[PDB]
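Narrative progress, year one. The postdoctoral researcher (J.K.) led the effort to move from monomer predictions toward full complexes, under supervision of the PI. The following entry was the first complex the group processed end to end, covering 614 residues in total.
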Amino acid sequence: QSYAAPPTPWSRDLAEPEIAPTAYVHSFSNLIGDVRIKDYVHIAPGTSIRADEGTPFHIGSRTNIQDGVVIHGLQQGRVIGDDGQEYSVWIGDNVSITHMALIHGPAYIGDGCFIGFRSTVFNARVGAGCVVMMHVLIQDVEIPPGKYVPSGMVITTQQQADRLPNVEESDIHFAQHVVGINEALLSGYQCAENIACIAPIRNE
Amino acid sequence: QSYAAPPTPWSRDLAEPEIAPTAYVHSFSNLIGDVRIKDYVHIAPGTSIRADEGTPFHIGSRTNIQDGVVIHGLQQGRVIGDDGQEYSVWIGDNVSITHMALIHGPAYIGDGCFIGFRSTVFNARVGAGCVVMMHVLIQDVEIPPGKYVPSGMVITTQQQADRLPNVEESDIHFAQHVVGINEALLSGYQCAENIACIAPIRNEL
Amino acid sequence: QSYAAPPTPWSRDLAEPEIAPTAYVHSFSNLIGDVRIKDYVHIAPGTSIRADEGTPFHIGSRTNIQDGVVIHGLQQGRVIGDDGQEYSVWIGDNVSITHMALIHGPAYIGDGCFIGFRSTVFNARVGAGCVVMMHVLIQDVEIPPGKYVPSGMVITTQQQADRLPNVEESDIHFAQHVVGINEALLSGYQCAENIACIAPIRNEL
Ligand SMILES: [Cl-]
Ligand SMILES: [Zn+2]
Ligand SMILES: [Zn+2]
Ligand SMILES: [Zn+2]
């Protein structure tokens, strides 16, 4: 369920989502505007990705976007993607954006991040390899690369973002497991759409 | 995707939403019961507004309801609207109910309010011109007009509600911007649903 | 929108949901895999219940699942249900899972529980007859039966779980009311899909 961006004083290109053929988007979801989805992305049910104000959005390869997630952006304000271009929202490679998370542009999330349940990133950079846990708010700050954020933290000042602990080895594996589970899920959903793949399994 | 209220021990009128022709409601949403939606309202994808228990709901002119929002109400309990009528939920004019907010009747939200990301108003009055920030709970209280609520606050007592700072000039300016932005989006989406409007635009590309 | 579980290294049975004819599931929602939904269950708009990683899920009789709720499970990790079978998610009878709640397996929620607005149970056991309020996180712990949890609490250690107050009689009556309300909603929505039932009601208008 994908649509063009609406014509507004700030946008007239009527841009539509670019989705990799290796990605899987569940039917029960809504995608509007210039949303660039690279290889092996899994977009789960109940999600609304809306690139009508702030635009464009980038979602990197092997990244998962889980149930009930919202992605939107402010009309004014951008970050620099790794390609040199400006984005309302940049999410890197091998990122997990988990259940009911909110990612609000301007926002940069680096490669390998885990963003936990019901957590929000708004007007903020989160460095590569961060593990952010459950019920967290991050707003108006830069989180250094490789940091761990405990559940329930409300981070609104740089002073707070500057005193976070380094991730442990167990956090790094925990994060890569979630990435792998969603790659496996994506392929299974693609198999079920194809008579040649699903028929032999269904006969057993 | 608009439906009548179901028949229950407390209701039998099977009421359906009244939507102003100048409003825009996204396809990917669900609307049930006596929901009265006024001029230039924008209702975004993922929203569930359900007037099957407490009823009616009123959503005022130039108000936006953003993605993943839920509105419901308790069967018992009402607020007095600006028209003298009883409502489960009353949302005024020029209001922003932003991403993932929950408004739960009995509730009154006054003209010009901003209700921030993932925030909840339940069994409460929020006076006109309040600016509520992110991840806030407001419950069983009255917030005076023109107050600012910092992010993360869990307000459950009147003692807390009585000790809030006044909104600042830059808060007002931020609130009005969000209102105007959404007015512009609704007219854009209506153009896309009209061949005469959107065709000449796609021709320029 | 009812879907089979996908073929995967941990599951190839392609299970689909089993839904009691006396349950009402709103159209605007998504169900995937081995989800066992019992008698008189109400599933509200905007819900996603997904048994593709952890599986199976169990939802008991007269239980309600309200708007925007998400249910999922870890691939590894199970709890024992009251039937003596293993589940990623067990939700018992006469339970309320309210607006925007998240239940994430491994999870057990006993009979008679109230789980409040925007609250989370993950890798946890919540005993029979608990009343959990609003904007709560319960994580990695066991809450004994008959306990009350104030709004906004973040419970991540057993030490917190061990110092909770008992429910009061008024909390019990409050919980059963919400269950009763949702049963009455359920039969109303079914009445509207039965011409015998809805025809005389509509002719009064
Ligand atoms: Cl939420
Ligand atoms: Zn926004
Ligand atoms: Zn309710
Ligand atoms: Zn999960």
